[PDB]
Amino acid sequence: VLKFTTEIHPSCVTRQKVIGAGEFGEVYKGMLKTSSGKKEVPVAIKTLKAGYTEKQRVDFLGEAGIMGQFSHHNIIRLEGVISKYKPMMIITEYMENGALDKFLREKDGEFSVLQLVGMLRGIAAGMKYLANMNYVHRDLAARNILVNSNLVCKVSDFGLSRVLEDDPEATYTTSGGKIPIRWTAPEAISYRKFTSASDVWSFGIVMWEVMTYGERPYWELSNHEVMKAINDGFRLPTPMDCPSAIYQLMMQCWQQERARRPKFADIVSILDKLIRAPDSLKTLADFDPRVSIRL
Numbered sequence: 001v002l003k004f005t006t007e008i009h010p011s012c013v014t015r016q017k018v019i020g021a022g023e024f025g026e027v028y029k030g031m032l033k034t035s036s037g038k039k040e041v042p043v044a045i046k047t048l049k050a051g052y053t054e055k056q057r058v059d060f061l062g063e064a065g066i067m068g069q070f071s072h073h074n075i076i077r078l079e080g081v082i083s084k085y086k087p088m089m090i091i092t093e094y095m096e097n098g099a100l101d102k103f104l105r106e107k108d109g110e111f112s113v114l115q116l117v118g119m120l121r122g123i124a125a126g127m128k129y130l131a132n133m134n135y136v137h138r139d140l141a142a143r144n145i146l147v148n149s150n151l152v153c154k155v156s157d158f159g160l161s162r163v164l165e166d167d168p169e170a171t172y173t174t175s176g177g178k179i180p181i182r183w184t185a186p187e188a189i190s191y192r193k194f195t196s197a198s199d200v201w202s203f204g205i206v207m208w209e210v211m212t213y214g215e216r217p218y219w220e221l222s223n224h225e226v227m228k229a230i231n232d233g234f235r236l237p238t239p240m241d242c243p244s245a246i247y248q249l250m251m252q253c254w255q256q257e258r259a260r261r262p263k264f265a266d267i268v269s270i271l272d273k274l275i276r277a278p279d280s281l282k283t284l285a286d287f288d289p290r291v292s293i294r295l
């Protein structure tokens with residue numbers, strides 16, 4: 001028995017603005033009337049346009065069904081679905097600052113170290129919750145994390161191919177594409193061994209995305225060049241202005257041997273201890289001089 005997913009009546013949903021457009025549906029900002037007409041809240045609304053295939057329907061509704069099993073501050077909240085009327089819709093809370101990667105790239109250098117570390121603690125708490133629920137995300141990356149007005153970060157992007165046994169799409173993105181290599185642990189790339197410990201590798205890459213304000217991991221390297229570097233033992237260098245303890249933690253997430261990586265519980269605990277003793281964050285890792293400027 002799974003937690004009940006609310007079927008929403010279309011009369012309770014208004015769409016105010018298109019915010020995203022795909023080939024197979026759109027995403028809107030809107031309002032949802034709830035509590036039997038007594039409350040109204042802002043929502044995001046994703047549609048599935050007519051002509052969708054059986055696979056697209058099972059995937060679309062499956063994402064909502066997974067989201068509906070979770071109740072955590074750092075996981076996107078589902079309000080419900082419209083499946084009985086067309087276009088079908090999934091309705092979630094609305095995250096005012098959108099995806100974390102784009103948000104940081106529009107906010108370069110504007111946050112404190114403590115704020116960035118706090119964002120990572122929230123993401124880590126959401127991932128701890130997911131891993132404890134026996135959910136392996138497989139595509140953890142800043143692009144799949146949303147940010148609200150209050151800077152709370154929440155994990156998004158769920159799918160049935162992550163939960164069903166021997167699923168033939170388990171190694172693809174939720175859109176059927178190739179999962180971007182540069183967030184993925186070596187044993188998941190080479191053997192398809194996706195587990196919470198490969199999600200810990202990905203979380204280390206997310207830490208580096210956050211501390212760099214959304215830089216592209218490995219910069220211009222191609223996918224094969226990233227695989228070359230990782231398998232030689234190369235790891236991403238420290239971000240600028242990054243606490244030594246934070247860079248050490250991301251390096252531990254990138255241990256080749258998956259059993260040596262921290263668990264999500266370890267990550268949350270370490271981040272909490274650093275935030276509560278903030279002088280621990282003033283020791284910075286050396287930023288490796290990339291350019292020589294002499295005068």
Ligand SMILES: Cc1cccc(Cl)c1NC(=O)c1cnc(Nc2cc(C(=O)NC3CCNCC3)cc(-c3ccccc3N)c2)s1
Binds near residue numbers: 019095098157
């Ligand atoms: C509805 C739904 C169904 C299934 C799965 C999920 Cl996770 C969801 N929920 C959502 O997608 C979303 C919840 N909140 C969101 N916030 C959001 C917010 C905004 C938006 O208003 N962003 C601000 C606009 C001004 N710049 C600062 C960001 C834009 C998007 C967005 C959506 C599609 C393509 C590009 C975009 N930039 C998204 S999207």
